[PDB]
Amino acid sequence: VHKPGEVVVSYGGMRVRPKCYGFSRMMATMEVNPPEQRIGQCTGCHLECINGGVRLITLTSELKSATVCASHFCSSATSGKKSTEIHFHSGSLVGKAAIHVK
Amino acid sequence: CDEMVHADSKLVSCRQGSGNMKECVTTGRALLPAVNPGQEACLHFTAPGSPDSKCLKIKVKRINLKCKKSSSYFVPDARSRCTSVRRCRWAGDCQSGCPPHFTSNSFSDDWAGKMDRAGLGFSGCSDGCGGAACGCFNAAPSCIFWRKWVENPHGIIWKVSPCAAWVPSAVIELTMPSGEVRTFHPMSGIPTQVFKGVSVTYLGSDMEVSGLTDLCEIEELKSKKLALAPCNQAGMGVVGKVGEIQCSSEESARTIKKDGCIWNADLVGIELRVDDAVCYSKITSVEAVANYSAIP
Amino acid sequence: GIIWKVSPCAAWVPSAVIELTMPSGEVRTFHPMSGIPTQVFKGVSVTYLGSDMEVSGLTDLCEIEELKSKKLALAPCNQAGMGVVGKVGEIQCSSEESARTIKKDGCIWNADLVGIELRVDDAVCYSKITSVEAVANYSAIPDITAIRGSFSVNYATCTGEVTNVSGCYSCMTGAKVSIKLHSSKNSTAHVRCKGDETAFSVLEGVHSYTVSLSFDHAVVD
Amino acid sequence: CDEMVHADSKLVSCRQGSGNMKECVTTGRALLPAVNPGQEACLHFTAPGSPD
Amino acid sequence: SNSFSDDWAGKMDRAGLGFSGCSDGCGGAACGCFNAAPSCIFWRKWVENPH
Amino acid sequence: KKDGCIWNADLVGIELRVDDAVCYSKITSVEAVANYSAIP
Amino acid sequence: GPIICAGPIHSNKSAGIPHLLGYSEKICQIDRLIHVSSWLRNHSQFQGYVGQRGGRSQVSYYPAENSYSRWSGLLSPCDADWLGMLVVKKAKGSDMIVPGPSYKGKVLFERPTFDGYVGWGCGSGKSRTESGELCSSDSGTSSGLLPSDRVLWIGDVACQPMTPIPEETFLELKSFSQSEFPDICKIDGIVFNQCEGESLPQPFDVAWMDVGHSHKIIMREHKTKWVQESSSKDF
Amino acid sequence: VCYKEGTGPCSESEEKACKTSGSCRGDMQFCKVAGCEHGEEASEAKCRCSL
Ligand SMILES: *[C@@H]1O[C@H](CO)[C@@H](O[C@@H]2O[C@H](CO)[C@@H](O[C@H]3O[C@H](CO)[C@@H](O)[C@H](O)[C@@H]3O)[C@H](O)[C@H]2NC(C)=O)[C@H](O)[C@H]1NC(C)=O
Numbered sequence A: 001v002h003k004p005g006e007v008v009v010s011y012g013g014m015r016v017r018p019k020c021y022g023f024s025r026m027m028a029t030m031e032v033n034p035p036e037q038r039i040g041q042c043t044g045c046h047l048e049c050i051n052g053g054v055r056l057i058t059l060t061s062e063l064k065s066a067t068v069c070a071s072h073f074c075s076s077a078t079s080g081k082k083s084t085e086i087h088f089h090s091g092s093l094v095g096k097a098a099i100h101v102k
Numbered sequence B: 001c002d003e004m005v006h007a008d009s010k011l012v013s014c015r016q017g018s019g020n021m022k023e024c025v026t027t028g029r030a031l032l033p034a035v036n037p038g039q040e041a042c043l044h045f046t047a048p049g050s051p052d053s054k055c056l057k058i059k060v061k062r063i064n065l066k067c068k069k070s071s072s073y074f075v076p077d078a079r080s081r082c083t084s085v086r087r088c089r090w091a092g093d094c095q096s097g098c099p100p101h102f103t104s105n106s107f108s109d110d111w112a113g114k115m116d117r118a119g120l121g122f123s124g125c126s127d128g129c130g131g132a133a134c135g136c137f138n139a140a141p142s143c144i145f146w147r148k149w150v151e152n153p154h155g156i157i158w159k160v161s162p163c164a165a166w167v168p169s170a171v172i173e174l175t176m177p178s179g180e181v182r183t184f185h186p187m188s189g190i191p192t193q194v195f196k197g198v199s200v201t202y203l204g205s206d207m208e209v210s211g212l213t214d215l216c217e218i219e220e221l222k223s224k225k226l227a228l229a230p231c232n233q234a235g236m237g238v239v240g241k242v243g244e245i246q247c248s249s250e251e252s253a254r255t256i257k258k259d260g261c262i263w264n265a266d267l268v269g270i271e272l273r274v275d276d277a278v279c280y281s282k283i284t285s286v287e288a289v290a291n292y293s294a295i296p
Numbered sequence C: 001g002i003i004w005k006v007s008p009c010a011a012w013v014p015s016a017v018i019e020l021t022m023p024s025g026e027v028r029t030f031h032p033m034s035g036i037p038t039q040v041f042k043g044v045s046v047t048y049l050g051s052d053m054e055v056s057g058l059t060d061l062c063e064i065e066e067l068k069s070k071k072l073a074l075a076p077c078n079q080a081g082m083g084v085v086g087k088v089g090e091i092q093c094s095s096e097e098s099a100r101t102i103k104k105d106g107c108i109w110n111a112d113l114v115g116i117e118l119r120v121d122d123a124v125c126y127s128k129i130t131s132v133e134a135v136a137n138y139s140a141i142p143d144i145t146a147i148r149g150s151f152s153v154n155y156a157t158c159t160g161e162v163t164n165v166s167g168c169y170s171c172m173t174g175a176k177v178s179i180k181l182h183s184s185k186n187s188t189a190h191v192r193c194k195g196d197e198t199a200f201s202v203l204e205g206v207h208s209y210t211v212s213l214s215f216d217h218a219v220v221d
Numbered sequence D: 001c002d003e004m005v006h007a008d009s010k011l012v013s014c015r016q017g018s019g020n021m022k023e024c025v026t027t028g029r030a031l032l033p034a035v036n037p038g039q040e041a042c043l044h045f046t047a048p049g050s051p052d
Numbered sequence E: 001s002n003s004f005s006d007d008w009a010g011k012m013d014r015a016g017l018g019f020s021g022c023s024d025g026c027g028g029a030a031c032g033c034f035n036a037a038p039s040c041i042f043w044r045k046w047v048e049n050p051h
Numbered sequence F: 001k002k003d004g005c006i007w008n009a010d011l012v013g014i015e016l017r018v019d020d021a022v023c024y025s026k027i028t029s030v031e032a033v034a035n036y037s038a039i040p
Numbered sequence G: 001g002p003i004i005c006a007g008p009i010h011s012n013k014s015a016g017i018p019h020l021l022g023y024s025e026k027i028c029q030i031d032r033l034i035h036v037s038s039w040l041r042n043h044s045q046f047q048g049y050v051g052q053r054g055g056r057s058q059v060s061y062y063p064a065e066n067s068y069s070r071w072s073g074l075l076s077p078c079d080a081d082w083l084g085m086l087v088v089k090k091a092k093g094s095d096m097i098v099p100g101p102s103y104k105g106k107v108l109f110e111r112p113t114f115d116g117y118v119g120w121g122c123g124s125g126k127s128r129t130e131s132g133e134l135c136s137s138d139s140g141t142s143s144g145l146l147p148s149d150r151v152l153w154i155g156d157v158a159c160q161p162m163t164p165i166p167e168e169t170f171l172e173l174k175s176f177s178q179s180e181f182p183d184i185c186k187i188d189g190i191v192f193n194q195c196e197g198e199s200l201p202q203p204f205d206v207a208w209m210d211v212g213h214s215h216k217i218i219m220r221e222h223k224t225k226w227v228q229e230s231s232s233k234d235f
Numbered sequence H: 001v002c003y004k005e006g007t008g009p010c011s012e013s014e015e016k017a018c019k020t021s022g023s024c025r026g027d028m029q030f031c032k033v034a035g036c037e038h039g040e041e042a043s044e045a046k047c048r049c050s051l
Helices: G023-031 G034-044 G167-180 H012-017
Strands: A020-027 B058-066 B073-075 B079-081 B149-151 B158-160 B167-174 B216-220 B226-229 B268-271 B278-281 C004-006 C045-048 C062-066 C072-075 C114-117 C124-127 C145-148 C162-164 C175-183 C208-215 F012-015 F022-025 G109-112 G117-120 G156-159 G203-210 G217-219
Touching: A020 G109, B079 B278, G023 G034, G167 G217
Parallel strands: none
Antiparallel strands: A020 G156, A020 G203, B058 B167, B073 B158, B079 B149, B158 B216, B216 B226, B268 B278, C004 C062, C045 C145, C062 C072, C114 C124, C162 C175, C175 C208, F012 F022, G109 G117, G203 G217
């Protein structure tokens, strides 16, 4: 008979005989998982002493009460600051001692 | 505010829509000096009538060096998969001379034409096994048809832009006289014109400039971190660059289905055998191929 | 014929040998080119780049291999889509099953390569082709990390009962310690906190066995 | 293994197909240091439940 | 370059021979009109003189 | 509006985005671009 | 064209075709679409002789060009029913149509599924002139002559005698299919991977094979292989 | 739009149903969210709603 021949499907380290090999359209479904989450939380910020001016170093005692792995930015003080440590890990009770010229 | 400049109210056209409180509409141009960082600058408004007037406060926050996204492109994580349907001659009846024309999208050989999970993979015949070993008893050889997929099971996507420049810019907050507060980032080293409401801010003094090599930014959609590289980019993927697949829809950046994104000739590693073809690849990951820094 | 398959990488980057252990118990081998951010696909996981802690340079050379496997040979090994003048590879042909004869179209000739010359009666044969050997030959051979896909993760009384200690501190392998346990279930163990050197990852059967692991210390705790 | 890094199991989605033994499906990314040649490196998996 | 049938057929153009073009295409749920393939955008430029 | 006056190829600064295009320019004012005197 | 012969044309419609023990006699009968009519008398209850002068030379399938259609030697699932390999079954209300083809003048179409093979029928005189499930009365179909007009088959399927695999080998394929499609969770209501809530309207088209077990298997990274050997059945 | 394609459009009792019902089929952007229950109407299909 005018046939191509027998079929064998080899699929990722296997050798399998098909009773019926074919393609067809099927009725299916799809799912979705909502994106986004949000966080906020009180932090203790205190100032032991200050030596701001032109000199880069200052003594600032701020803390965090949070658990998030990824830490966001931080900000500056008056008279044009940009703290060398804006992002610093926020998982555990790790205080942050910044530097300024205020 | 320490530095303050009043308007030029000589443009006078006010319609007395209400008698208790007046109304007026005006425009013009102004030249106010740059304020020190961390402070706000003012702008005084005057009217020919005495009692009423308003103000406008322009607050600066930061000075830094960013560059503008002249373009934008997405990069998926390519993988190379390849199938093989192996007819033999007089049973696939495929032409003695392999048809030099190849239909790269349908593939009527295996289920007519449908959506292809590859982005324009190629086609071809091959050399032919024939005889008792391959078992279909014809002497003459057999053509084999092969596919290549550029695929992405669980991608991590990067959007990139080749500014290839660095000019000072700042952070601005604005105070409409009504009481609105709208934020934006003006590229005030370049005479860019950002549009909002009624006003537009523009250039400042480039009191210091610096030079730097051909580098530009790499960012991740899950936001692993931010990365820097030589970061070559153009309309096409040049040899040896960071970005090969350059694809222009985030919602279509998971799979490879939008036409906008553009392949490389013979990029995927298809190689043949006596029975069927196997997959390899020569693509390079973004990391550790040409990396000159890593952001703290 | 004696057939050679060739590829022009024209580069050299460090790579290694990796064997993998699926949590189910599968063991699949592969060779990752971990100097290049290549992504090898298997099962659910994929491994990728490492640190190129040393690199070196080398000239335009690439590999020559024989199908009967006489031996392995190296050459300048020029290759492209076409056969350029004076190169190692003139006939470049893309089917092993059709590599004995010359019948597949994929492989590509050279203009006026074969030496036909005429006479007063009939033409005679000559050639100007060159063998692979002794034409241009310059030698003769004598932070690993992975990305996770959609895994297939699966899911009581137990005693430790150590037996002995070996000797190593500050040797690159560490000392090997043996522990004789038994547990009613098939399970996996975890770290000793005071060992102060490394974590643990043992796996046991439901009997009394011993599985030995490597560690180093100044004094045993 | 001497160098060992545990997973980041914060991705939690497990369907209780069977009560005696649980099931779960997860993914992610990991960064383990390169081990010395001739030795094997590990990767620990954790679940919110204790025993397994 | 003079009519622009896309937005109200062809009329007086307050620009002096500004150009035309398509662009790259946003497509998907983000731009919201649910087709996969990208979208062309048409743009004008005016050379103008208020006062 | 008169045809007699003549433009410059790609003089006006059109640039695109993911949604819509924004305006810029590279033209120069007559003053302080190349000025070598000012009449008393 | 014909495996053996062109199918007979007998004017008197009211005839029930009987059984035959012969192997090389039923194939040309299968060429005549004799078996599908028997399904109607069994489930649809109509003595409609199907496809006069048609054979396998004019029958059309939804995909535009079918290479497997050219090959009459291969065997299609509805023709695996006469020979006892597989059996097609009725349709339940929870089973839904696929909006692909143009359902004009039909009575019997196939649809291979995850579980089995499904056939749908209408009444005699109930012409099918729309994709809906509702069948429509009309006298324009009183004559039984139709070139596969009522016989339109979905999919491009090849079938053959097979030798099974152990149960564990089946379990390997089922798990591996789950890993390759992370997004797919629910199919035809049958669980593929349990997930959270899911949408509904989406037609779906991947290749598949059957190896003698309940759960169907799908693939995207497969390599086929074509061998033909002298088998007494294949004559 | 909803139309019975026989005796014209759907009824008010029909179109009000076909935002709550589960038998009248339709095209996409109408089944993902509005829920075409796709009643297998072999004969006498209910009225289809498209865009
Ligand atoms: C529709 O129903 C018919 C009767 O219910 C049925 O006819 C029956 O067909 C079977 C086929 O297996 C015959 O079974 C015997 O014959 C076969 C070979 O022909 C043998 O291999 C079997 O072992 C068995 O001995 C029945 O004899 C036959 N019925 C009668 C009364 O003879 C049709 O096959 C049914 N058609 C469909 C599509 O379901």
